[PDB]
Amino acid sequence: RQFSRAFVPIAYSLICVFGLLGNILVVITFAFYKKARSMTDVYLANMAIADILFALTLPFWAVSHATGAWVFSNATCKLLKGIYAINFNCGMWLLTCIAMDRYIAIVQKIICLVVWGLSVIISSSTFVFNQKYNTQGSDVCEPKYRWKLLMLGLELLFGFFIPLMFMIFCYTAIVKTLRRQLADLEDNWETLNDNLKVIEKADNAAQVKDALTKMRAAALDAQKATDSPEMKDFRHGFDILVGQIDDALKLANEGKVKEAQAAAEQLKTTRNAYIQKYLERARSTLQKEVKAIRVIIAVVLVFLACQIPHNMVLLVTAANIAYTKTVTEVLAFLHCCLNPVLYAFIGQKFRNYFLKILKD
């Protein structure tokens, strides 16, 4: 409580200098490599500029916690709380835009002003609910509070519950789609190899004809995986493959086991030349798209697991415990530093590009 007031201006200042420096390097990477910027990137860069705006607002909180009481005016306090609320709402709705963009990209300026502009609307409840109360010998600036409560509840529902269910639907759909695509790809490849071994070790034409049936159904499925020259090299390599299965099913229908096994030995040449080369090409593209989603998943999970308890504490307390207030306050203020940390560990686009900045 009173002891906890002593450690947080050291922690918030350390949050301030690392959080300021962490996100300018992101936004100076955004100005040096504008050719490779992306939708997600732009939304992530807007989250970074909201983070350095919060980094500028942090030293006011540092002095206000170091003095033990609020020194500046009420305009400053509701400016600080509105800046924190616009940071939270900007992060939530930019992750909403990222989720929508990645859903419409995988399953299937003028944006940035809208997401920033819409965040002022939901943070307008913070501008009127917060006032400096001089109670119990302490002049502290905390929110306290029928139409205003209805406006707060409607804005809370519309800005939080719809994007959270929208995220937990969309990102699970992305993960399930990517994992089932990899599972279908590997199942088709394992069918094509295992039934080839079955044909090679077979003795009677009943299992040769039955294994080619399973090979033809998997080679027809793997052709649907995929006007480019690489597009013509993929599908024509499967038209040879299914066309060579039909040359062995026709031989196995005549009752020739040894001629069917020799004709299915030529399926190894097409599998090595046309199939295995684009098996690894399609596999490595799926592992890259999984790794990009795993960065976005870690960004969403860090943002909610840090900012949701402080938002629930301030909503419960103002509607109606000393240790949980300062723990939740430093947890949501810690998020300003955790965002460029995640871009430096698993953030492959940021890490390789920032290393080129140090060379230049």
Partner: antibody
Framework: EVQLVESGGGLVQPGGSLRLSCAAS????????LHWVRQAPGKGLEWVAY????????SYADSVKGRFTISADTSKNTAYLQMNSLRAEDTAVYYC?????????????????WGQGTLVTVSS | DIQMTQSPSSLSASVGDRVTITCRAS??????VAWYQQKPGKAPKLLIY???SLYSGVPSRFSGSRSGTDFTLTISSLQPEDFATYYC??????????FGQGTKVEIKR
Amino acid sequence: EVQLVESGGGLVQPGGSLRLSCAASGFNVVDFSLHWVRQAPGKGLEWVAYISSSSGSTSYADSVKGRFTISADTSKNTAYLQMNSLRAEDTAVYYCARWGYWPGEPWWKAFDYWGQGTLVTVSS
Amino acid sequence: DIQMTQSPSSLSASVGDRVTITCRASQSVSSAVAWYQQKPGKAPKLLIYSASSLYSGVPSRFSGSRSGTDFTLTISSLQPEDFATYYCQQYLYYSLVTFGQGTKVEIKR
């Protein structure tokens, strides 16, 4: 338009023989495999046999293997289903359908154009 | 050795209904499934090929879908002409084609 007609259906004794026809007009048999499909009176469709005029490859169902023999004649653009040892379960309507060749979209349109079928009835 | 199991053996519906006929393959047959319509006393007509693509000539109220080895023919709006028998067929190879049992669509009364 292109079409397939059928002929040779009729009434025979059990154990007899009958050669059906399927005159294809408007397209060539060297572009399409010709199939014979069977529908018993009151029952569903059942595949019998097919013929690949180009590669000469042919196949039959289990119930018609050995007794049935299908040939092609590209000079007259016809197909023949010679049926011998006609048991009592072979009285049906016979349809002659066409099917394209791998690769491409002609293979994916399975039995796009049919014939009107002929009734083959076996009874003593 | 690949069996198609057309589940509704008979169907009764009125004009304007949306009906769904389901078929199930014994093995995987990729998307090589066709849907045919036969009126009584006439040859079958191809409606759906490659399990989703409606044939050039049939109306657009017919649609097809694939979920694993479960294939579905959907008629969005019934019509007097719609009533007929419908067959699901797998065509994985020339010598392995098999039809479904059939589904007679009748008039609800």
